[PDB]
Symmetry: C4
Subunit: 389 residues, 4 copies
Amino acid sequence: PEWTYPRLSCPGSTFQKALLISPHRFGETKGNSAPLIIREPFIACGPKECKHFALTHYAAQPGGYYNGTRGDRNKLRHLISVKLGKIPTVENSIFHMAAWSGSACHDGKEWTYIGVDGPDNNALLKIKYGEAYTDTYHSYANNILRTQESACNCIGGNCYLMITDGSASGISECRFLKIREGRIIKEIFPTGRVKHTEECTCGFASNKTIECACRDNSYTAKRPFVKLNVETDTAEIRLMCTETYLDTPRPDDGSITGPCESNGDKGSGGIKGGFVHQRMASKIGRWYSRTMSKTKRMGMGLYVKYDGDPWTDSDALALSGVMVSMEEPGWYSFGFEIKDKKCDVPCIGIEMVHDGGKETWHSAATAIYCLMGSGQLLWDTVTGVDMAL
Amino acid sequence: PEWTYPRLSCPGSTFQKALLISPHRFGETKGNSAPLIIREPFIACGPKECKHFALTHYAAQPGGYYNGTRGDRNKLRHLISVKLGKIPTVENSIFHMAAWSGSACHDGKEWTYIGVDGPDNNALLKIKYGEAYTDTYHSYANNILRTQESACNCIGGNCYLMITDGSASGISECRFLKIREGRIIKEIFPTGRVKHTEECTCGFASNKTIECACRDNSYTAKRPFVKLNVETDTAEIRLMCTETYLDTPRPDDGSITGPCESNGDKGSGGIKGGFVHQRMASKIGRWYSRTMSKTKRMGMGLYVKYDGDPWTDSDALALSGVMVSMEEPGWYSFGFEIKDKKCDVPCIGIEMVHDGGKETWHSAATAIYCLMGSGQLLWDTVTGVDMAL
Amino acid sequence: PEWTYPRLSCPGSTFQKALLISPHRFGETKGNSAPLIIREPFIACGPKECKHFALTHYAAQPGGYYNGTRGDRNKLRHLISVKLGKIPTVENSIFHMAAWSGSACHDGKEWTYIGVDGPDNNALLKIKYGEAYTDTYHSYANNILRTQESACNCIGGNCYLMITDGSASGISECRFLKIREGRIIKEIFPTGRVKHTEECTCGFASNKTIECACRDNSYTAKRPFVKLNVETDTAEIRLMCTETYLDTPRPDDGSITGPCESNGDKGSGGIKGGFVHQRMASKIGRWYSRTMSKTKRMGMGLYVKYDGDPWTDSDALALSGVMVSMEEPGWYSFGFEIKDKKCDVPCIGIEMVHDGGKETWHSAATAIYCLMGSGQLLWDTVTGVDMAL
Amino acid sequence: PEWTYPRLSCPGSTFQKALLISPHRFGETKGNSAPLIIREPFIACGPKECKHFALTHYAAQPGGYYNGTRGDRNKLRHLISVKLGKIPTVENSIFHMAAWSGSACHDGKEWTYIGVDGPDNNALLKIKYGEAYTDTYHSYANNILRTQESACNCIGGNCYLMITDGSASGISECRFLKIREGRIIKEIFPTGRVKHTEECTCGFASNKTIECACRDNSYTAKRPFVKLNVETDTAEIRLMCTETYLDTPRPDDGSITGPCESNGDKGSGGIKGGFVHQRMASKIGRWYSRTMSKTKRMGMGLYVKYDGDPWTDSDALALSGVMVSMEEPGWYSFGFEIKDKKCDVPCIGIEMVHDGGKETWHSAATAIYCLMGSGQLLWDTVTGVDMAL
Ligand SMILES: *[C@@H]1O[C@H](CO)[C@@H](O[C@@H]2O[C@H](CO)[C@@H](O[C@@H]3O[C@H](CO[C@H]4O[C@H](CO[C@H]5O[C@H](CO)[C@@H](O)[C@H](O)[C@@H]5O)[C@@H](O)[C@H](O[C@H]5O[C@H](CO)[C@@H](O)[C@H](O)[C@@H]5O)[C@@H]4O)[C@@H](O)[C@H](O)[C@@H]3O)[C@H](O)[C@H]2NC(C)=O)[C@H](O)[C@H]1NC(C)=O
Ligand SMILES: *[C@@H]1O[C@H](CO)[C@@H](O[C@@H]2O[C@H](CO)[C@@H](O[C@@H]3O[C@H](CO[C@H]4O[C@H](CO[C@H]5O[C@H](CO)[C@@H](O)[C@H](O)[C@@H]5O)[C@@H](O)[C@H](O[C@H]5O[C@H](CO)[C@@H](O)[C@H](O)[C@@H]5O)[C@@H]4O)[C@@H](O)[C@H](O)[C@@H]3O)[C@H](O)[C@H]2NC(C)=O)[C@H](O)[C@H]1NC(C)=O
Ligand SMILES: *[C@@H]1O[C@H](CO)[C@@H](O[C@@H]2O[C@H](CO)[C@@H](O[C@@H]3O[C@H](CO[C@H]4O[C@H](CO[C@H]5O[C@H](CO)[C@@H](O)[C@H](O)[C@@H]5O)[C@@H](O)[C@H](O[C@H]5O[C@H](CO)[C@@H](O)[C@H](O)[C@@H]5O)[C@@H]4O)[C@@H](O)[C@H](O)[C@@H]3O)[C@H](O)[C@H]2NC(C)=O)[C@H](O)[C@H]1NC(C)=O
Ligand SMILES: *[C@@H]1O[C@H](CO)[C@@H](O[C@@H]2O[C@H](CO)[C@@H](O[C@@H]3O[C@H](CO[C@H]4O[C@H](CO[C@H]5O[C@H](CO)[C@@H](O)[C@H](O)[C@@H]5O)[C@@H](O)[C@H](O[C@H]5O[C@H](CO)[C@@H](O)[C@H](O)[C@@H]5O)[C@@H]4O)[C@@H](O)[C@H](O)[C@@H]3O)[C@H](O)[C@H]2NC(C)=O)[C@H](O)[C@H]1NC(C)=O
Ligand SMILES: [Ca+2]
Ligand SMILES: [Ca+2]
Ligand SMILES: [Ca+2]
Ligand SMILES: [Ca+2]
């Protein structure tokens, strides 16, 4: 085969509901199935197939290992995948590696699978290229080394990946790695607004540039926004200037007072956010998602803006549609791209967590929406699960 | 590969029982299986494989989501498929897209998957070519935009598809779309008898012509009959003239008084009907199916006529055989064609619904019959399910 | 690819235990599995893969459809297959066609699947070549038209198959069909001892000749023995002359008084028997199996003789080994051949039925033995099932 | 394709936790899964895929066949495999052959599968090349003929395999077989320290030499160490001289008094041990594993030494890390190698048995660790199973 490159995007001007993967529809006590207990789902596509990835707790519903299934980190956690369209069950899924933080991508020839493992103070990023484990990367701040929980991005064979290390409540200065046939050939140290960046959702703006919309878990409700030049291997981060704050929790739109870089208030905590590019011949669409509630992980709206500089443009993003109603859960979101025959189709995934607290099972559905045709986004998504079944 | 074209049909002069897919044979409380709760099954074949499609309620038997499983439209409904011959279970099936109305076909190179989604007043036809979502089509009468629930038909790369929009009890003027590598490149507006046409079962009479036997849900028990010329992309509809009324409910054969186009009575409601072509060197066989009961969805007989014009020929269709006994359920039927090495094999599928009303589970089996050898059709089909197990 | 031909057999001079497929090891009430309820299992191999076939009752254990699972013929019965080595479960299996009698073979290019269906007085042989149903054959004695329940045999593209029609207690004069790309191109009418022949187990003695060891269900305990010349398409049947009577029930060896063709006594009823060829450069081995008990379907021994004419040679077959102990069930047996890189490996399968009578479940295991190395056959086979679990 | 050869090893200088396969995470009474009851797991990799092998008792958890599931040898035991990364369940697994002792390898073209079967006094080694059973080998000491329970090793098409025969408590003089396209073309009789050698874990030191670290079950806690020259087909065994005794049970390191060959005390019983090669341009790493407890099968540490002669070098192996804590079970270990694009990645597997005694179920998890990056080994492995669920 040949190395993948970003192409121009397929025709269209709205997103529509594509696909729901709700594995706990079949998790009943009175049923006969074994859906895997997961969180942090994401999707990544190669020239022939799309894979649906997740981090499992190594437990099924129904079952007896519900306890600890609300934590993030433990020695059983694993990166798993099914072909997108298959329900992620005990039998359908393939286990790639131990991990409580994850990424994966296809370079045109082969899959790269990334998983972070180990103790909180000395955790370890691990790289699998196909079947072969091929490299690692050590914790540099000794406080929960971490990666994206969404697809990495490859071009001409170089796959690019955000990592971060630091306190969830303080400084977490991310870096980027450049990975080629599964080995780290370069380290990139961003400049600019670097205080706290984690869970970057990234994609290609062009053959020169990768961008990402990230999460500040401590300081601000504005998403940190990465521009990485892949020709010089240099990166700069600044906050998104829009009044449409995309993190949760957040304050009311436009109420953060100051120039583009101000923080200011109700910006502790956060959430991973969907972000995807619509690349046209003389114009670029940036697509984003965020929660319907300003405070809780309920609902998910889709927004878009075409062109401008997100670092300096304070104008609202344009509401396109409600993807998940306020009455339904809306936790992490991510972007990804499907390869049609001659163009790329942008999409946004949504993690819909079934949360009853730590004294029952904790898992998620996944809702997908993608650019298709014209007009407005038309229908919303429900998980359909009753957690007591 | 290369684009598919209709060929001449394989030798034979009767249909025989081929294959039963009865997934609820394994749906017992005392069993360990997970058959998917479906309705509107259909089959479509490519150069190497046949796929068995259906619309699932995203629920299994045994299980706890039986409620609402008798409705047609909801936000969980999905187009799903297995390789024909596999039982459609939670694990075997692949989920293609959200949908409460469906079609699919293979053009020789790739699969096209069609699914209609959304609210009743502003629903949305969605097209997937392989992995990529590639186009849509908007509701034009704002009353339950709908498609065939059977295979679309491709030639030299153009795949043809009926849609319809309108009141189930009044006007539903269908159109046809011409789809190529998953994008709509033409709209066809039929002329002639257009009042109410839905659930068209279509196939190729030749390299010039596609025909379809459709359902009038309001006005008549005669099936509306489409002739679509694929060289000029034009279509005309008239009612079938035969005394052998193929819809259910219906009145006694030959009792509709008038010329070929009269309606007249007990023609409210309806059912999707099987229809398939037997193409010979200097002759054409048209194969049809209909319910044994004149009023209820019980039984299914197979009929045939060779040549003539169905628009103007009032003569009876020739009873070939009882495919499902009166004592067994017989709901939707469809036609399809399997590719043998140098010729096409015509077939008819039969949806056999397990119906106990809305206070239990609602799903279906699928019975297949195909042209094979000579003589008479020999055996009938039972689902073998006891719904209380 | 290219057409298959029989080659010379791989080196060796004993059979050994190869493989047990015991699906009811996982059929417990306290388990979570769904093994298919089958009988008449058999195996057939192509250039790349071996398929394990069976006739299912369309019911699993554990489950609620045990009743009728001891009969042979009904409208739910089906030919099913898994890759040999896989457990035949609801999900693993593929359903080929409705059938209560079965055969299948691979010609080098594609699989041919055969299934007999229909009413007792007017039953129907059906042929599937790959996905396509391609031909049939009508009942000629109107009394349970039937086929082999073991592999058919192809050469240069012509696949040969025994069928039979007639009373299980009287005359059942078999014929042979010659099938090519799934269509019957010739009918062969054997001559000689033709009174009663059914369930023929066949294979190639050479590029000219096919032989078979069959069952007489009415008249004799000597197996009828077919020699079919594939160059002239002619066939002759005579009884096996050996004192080692291979049917069950039978009388003590050598106690049938008379020349080679005498019947005489305790020859009602019968059983399908294993038979396979070991083809060498200047010598031919014939391998056979039979039940340890003279009267009941308990145990299974393996015997061999090299060269001679089975029609006229009254000498004992040479006991090679006990494949199933007297304490274990031993019902049908069959022969088959696995393709190694440059030679064919002969094998014998054994159906081991779990029989508690008609008021519980009725299914089978399958035990395989094959030519491998030298010396004596070393171990026997148990199903390991407790039917009350 | 082409024959496999050992290449130089991929860059790195530590092992890290790669992958846990814990099938009994889903074996609960309150679950819906069917993990196969196994022991003696091992892994073997070909140019495109890695297979995870094991010997099953032909029983699942949950289920009713727990009794006898703590013995080694019986007539139901089988060699089974899944693609590495898949959970070994009733449905996922493929059954290769009857066996209570096992090996397998890929020569670059095809898989060779080895299984020992039969009675204790006259057991039988059986070889399958692809689908074809192709050879055997007879018991030469009439006391539990046995093989490695780990991967065999192929080069230029010749695959090399240890076997052994003799009392578990006395003499068990092993030999090596040279197998090519599945037939034994040579027998190798080692010289030197031959009293007791079994369960050899082997790999290539080079294109000339294969080495193995074996088990003495009777006489000593020093692992017997095989050097086999593949150019002359000759082999010599001596004990490992290191003070770091690798068997269990064992005495305290360095406490066996004498020259390199002394036995002396607490050397009855034993365990199969992990061993794998790191081949560099001018240097060789030998990697080993052993149990944390000196007496019980609890924990598992990883050790390494670079260069020297293991026969004569008494120096300690270098502790690299704790792979399994003392509080967790640690039974058999093995080495294997994954093929990256241009180099080989060394790995060690660990069998973690769930042992509650013979009055419940007896099975195992499998933990994998592999050379990846630099620094120290960072995290340990737990099965996470509660055997009462
Ligand atoms: C990252 O860089 C990529 C490489 O630069 C870029 O890929 C290009 O994308 C554009 C989309 O705007 C495509 O241009 C379109 O071309 C089609 C017709 O396609 C045929 O013509 C092109 C060349 O025409 C143009 O370029 C030449 C110089 O190369 C000029 O002289 C001329 O002025 C034209 O503007 C030809 O190269 C194509 O060949 C490719 O595609 C075919 C079929 O798809 C393949 O079979 C073949 O292997 C090869 O890949 C093709 O025959 C036209 O209808 C449109 O109007 C438009 O001009 C290019 O095809 C494409 N180039 C290549 C080399 O693939 C990515 O878009 C860019 N990504 C991003 C996100 O910026
Ligand atoms: C839609 O249009 C299709 C294209 O027009 C049409 O396909 C044709 O179907 C007919 C069935 O009646 C086939 O004709 C049959 O031919 C076989 C022997 O096959 C060989 O001969 C043909 C050509 O012979 C005829 O046509 C030529 C002009 O083309 C005349 O001079 C002459 O008078 C003959 O009547 C040859 O083209 C075939 O080649 C095809 O098939 C081979 C093997 O199958 C392939 O390897 C090859 O790639 C190619 O596809 C072949 O060598 C004869 O025994 C029969 O009696 C009959 O005459 C045609 O093969 C076929 N044509 C093509 C180009 O495929 C579809 O039937 C039509 N569909 C419908 C529903 O109407
Ligand atoms: C059904 O008929 C088949 C065709 O007649 C027959 O197949 C033959 O089986 C015999 C087994 O005894 C094989 O003969 C063996 O040959 C190997 C070395 O193989 C190479 O040599 C042969 C030809 O040698 C003989 O024949 C020629 C005339 O053809 C004579 O002059 C000469 O005296 C020899 O006796 C050659 O054809 C082979 O080529 C085949 O095999 C190779 C590799 O396997 C393939 O790559 C190739 O495509 C082709 O298939 C080969 O190069 C020798 O070591 C043995 O001692 C033995 O003589 C034949 O190979 C084989 N013939 C063919 C054409 O395949 C079946 O056995 C028969 N079946 C039964 C049950 O009777
Ligand atoms: C078992 O034996 C194997 C065969 O002897 C041996 O394989 C060799 O392993 C070494 C690792 O040290 C490789 O050498 C490395 O080469 C790369 C660049 O690769 C290219 O160059 C080599 C030849 O260069 C050397 O040898 C020639 C004589 O052959 C000398 O004149 C010269 O002084 C050099 O030292 C060339 O053969 C390679 O071609 C192979 O690889 C390519 C791509 O991988 C394939 O496409 C091709 O089919 C072929 O397999 C290649 O173009 C260099 O960067 C390193 O510094 C190092 O020198 C060899 O490639 C490799 N040889 C072969 C024939 O594969 C195994 O290592 C040995 N195993 C063990 C455990 O001992
Ligand atoms: Ca925040
Ligand atoms: Ca009507
Ligand atoms: Ca008899
Ligand atoms: Ca010892």
